[PDB]
Amino acid sequence: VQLQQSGAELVKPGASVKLSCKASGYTFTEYFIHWVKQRSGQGLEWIGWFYPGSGSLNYNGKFKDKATFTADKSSSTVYLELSRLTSEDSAVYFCASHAYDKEPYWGQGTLVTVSAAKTTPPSVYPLAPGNSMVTLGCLVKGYFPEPVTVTWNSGSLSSGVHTFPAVLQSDLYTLSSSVTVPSSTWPSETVTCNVAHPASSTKVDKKIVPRD
Amino acid sequence: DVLMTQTPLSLPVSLGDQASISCRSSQSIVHSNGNTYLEWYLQKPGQSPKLLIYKVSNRFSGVPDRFSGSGSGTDFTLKINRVEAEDLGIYYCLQGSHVPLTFGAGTTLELKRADAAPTVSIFPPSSEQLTSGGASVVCFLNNFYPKDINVKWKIDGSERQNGVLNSWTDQDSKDSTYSMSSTLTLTKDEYERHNSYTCEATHKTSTSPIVKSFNRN
Secondary structure, rough: EEEEEOOOOOOOOOOOOOEEEEOOOOOOOOEEEEEEOOOOOOEEEEEEEEEOOEEEEEEEEEEEEHHHEEEOOOOOOOEEEEOOOOHHHHEEEEEEEEEOOOEEEEEOOOOEEOOOOOEEEEEEEEOOOOOEEEEEEEEEEEEEOOOOOEEEHOEOOOOEEEEOOOOOEEEEEEEEEEEEEEEEOOOOOOOOOEEEEEHHHHEEEEOOOOOO | OOOOEEEEOEEEEEEOEEEEEEOOOOOOOEEEOOEEEEEEEOOOOOOOEEEEEEEOOEEOHHHHHOEEEEEEEEEEEEEEEEOOHHHHEEEEEEEEOOOOEEEEEOOEEEEEEEEEEEEEEEEOOOHHHHHEEEEEEEEEEEEEEEOOOOEEEEEEOOEEOOOOOEEEEOOOOOOOOOEEEEEEEEEEHOOOOOOOOEEEEEOOOOOOOOOEEEEEE
């Protein structure tokens, strides 16, 4: 049994989105389909079940005005429609199937991002200090959408790095990356952060230099 | 609805240790057909939950036998004999007996190590940002243990709440520490009206905060 889900979605608030889940190899011994929501860094929440054999369904009361289950028998595919999208609907949505009194199988999940933002490259700022180690960094601010890729010295510097998960600032993303090297080696052996943002087709370098 | 109460939220262990995770239902979860549909899942980052135990005590095929489940009425327990690295992640229970189906809040299984105070570094706004009219002050709180930590920002001695954004790393795969980033974002206009900027870390390693500051001068 294999569950195949549709690809990632970026959609604007107020709109609606239609996610798909294609079950495989049950095949004659039909199944209930469950949908589950997981917000970024959060736990799991049950949306409802759908029974393709009759079209019967059942929603968690919390989702009764948000979710709509439908199906296509030709394609052995079931659908989850989410309407009147808000930021609260941004999440990964999982589909899971199971025959009567049998263990469930889960899909890979579909990422839904609800945002009005447009593609925006990051501003990249050096973090330089105002012991035996020194910590430097760079601030990656005001970009959309995720992801960005941060490296140091084009990747030759990788030990002692912490690149932090991005966070929403206004309706744009911001992250930071710190790097720690021996004090005796900076500024003599240069340190430069590199930030790639695929969606904006940009890649910028910011050398960290001592403050005046 | 059936409330599933999962404890503990965090479970630090050493490799080879015995781990026990529990789940309490607010009411009985015996399905009409006589079965108790209590399942246990392990979830790794960016991955779908993987089934470990179903119907309270039944190991899903391919799951190693160091995993076992038991329980009755309203108390259920997952046990892991001799924890391995591939066991680390977040565990969820799920009752499937009475709709709406409900999950426990989860348990993070992570690694134990010696306590470590954070290495705290503070950074003024760059001239590049100032020229654009913004002013972010960044504080890194790196390589600490255990994971719980608080950050407080002061501007000229007075506590500041608005414009602060925080981010946390997952447990480091090599030294088992945690790290945090805290950024205070102001406008240049407001940043230039004050002198002292301070970030304060409170962590179990001391009752007094670790304080880092700079003066705009």
